Ligand binder design. Sequence first.
Ligand SMILES: [Ca+2]
Ligand SMILES: [Ca+2]
Ligand SMILES: [Ca+2]
Ligand code: NA
Length: 481
Amino acid sequence: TNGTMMQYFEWHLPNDGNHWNRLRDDAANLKSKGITAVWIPPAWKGTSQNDVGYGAYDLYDLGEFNQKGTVRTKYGTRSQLQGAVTSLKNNGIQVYGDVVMNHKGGADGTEMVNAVEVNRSNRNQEISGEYTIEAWTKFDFPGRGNTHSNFKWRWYHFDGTDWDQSRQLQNKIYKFRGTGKAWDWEVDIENGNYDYLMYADIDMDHPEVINELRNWGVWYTNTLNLDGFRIDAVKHIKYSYTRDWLTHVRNTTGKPMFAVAEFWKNDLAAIENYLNKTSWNHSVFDVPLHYNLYNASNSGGYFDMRNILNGSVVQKHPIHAVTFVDNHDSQPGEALESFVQSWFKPLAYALILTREQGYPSVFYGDYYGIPTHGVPSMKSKIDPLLQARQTYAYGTQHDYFDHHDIIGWTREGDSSHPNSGLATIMSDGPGGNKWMYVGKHKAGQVWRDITGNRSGTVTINADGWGNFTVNGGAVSVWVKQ
Ligand SMILES: [Ca+2]
Ligand SMILES: [Ca+2]
Ligand SMILES: [Ca+2]
Ligand code: NA
């Protein structure tokens, strides 16, 4: 069956502690709509209750201990989280947990550390001599104590920080001194070594760090019975470390543990180098395709639809790419904002859901909407597309990316899925028609538009060709009536 995951969260979810409860009660529904895997938001304690989770204070606190002014995380308690995972599991849905290992924020205390300032545009270059700063690198976890783990963090487990409590100076990046201290290598090259990003940067070359995060990885997997991971900020993390961390977890638990890393860079060559350096042992989000979809939706129809897949990861690396329309990085208001316009969104979803290449992901923000930024729920338009993927998107595929506005592709379906086979067509401009081959053995069949956009039927001729139609700025997916 065609796998389909769902990012079950967006950046502006309410801080009401009922998100795990919602996931729990949505499990049965998700299963019926075709979702086979769910990527849950950071389940640990952030810098505050409000934290989306990427602040990453305590990875062993899943809304179980009183820390950072709260017991529950933004999403709920450990109990409520476990209830959600159980619900998904009982409904046959896999669970992918988010993983944040690049840094830690909200240190319990400070430490005086010898450091040097570095060029923020070239972290390889030091711009100050050595001197002592007060850095937030002490993590004792008073609320948790040693429950689950007695590992405590100190300055030497980090490579640097961006804040000196003593001399509160802005626009600074500090690199810690010490034997062997240096920015980790084989990370993105923007700003000449993008090891540092925010908060206290974790030293991926320190032996205790390597062993500890690996131990945490397995504890995390076993505690929540995870089936996979969504790995955060991989371009800022030692490439070989991530590769080996994953292998360690797979080796220890014995589970395949699917994993998709977010290497956020609209650069195919950079992502390909990342896959190479990680020995292709996990997939990556197709960020390049995201920008293609964004640009097409932003072109008022002037985008050349023939090249919508050009430069994407899924075009050259189909089984190592997780395709997506939007996510918390691109939604309205965020730094990397590049939200795919709603008029084009159904087309984008048809692109990633009805084609054979890539592992598609549905964005919670798109499905249930983003109330805070006026983005309406588009499940009514996505549900039919998920239906098409679930029962009709199978078999040999034929592509027709031969027109600047109207493009499409077909699937001949296969014996393993009854009535399977489809023909999606879309136009980022005026509507029209296109003759497409769905298979001679389908001769005589009468197809209909599962999206409901076009109300008539299309009959496949004796040669297996059908003249499919589509409306302006829309998509139609024809299937056996
Ligand atoms: Ca280092
Ligand atoms: Ca880093
Ligand atoms: Ca066009
Ligand atoms: Na580092």
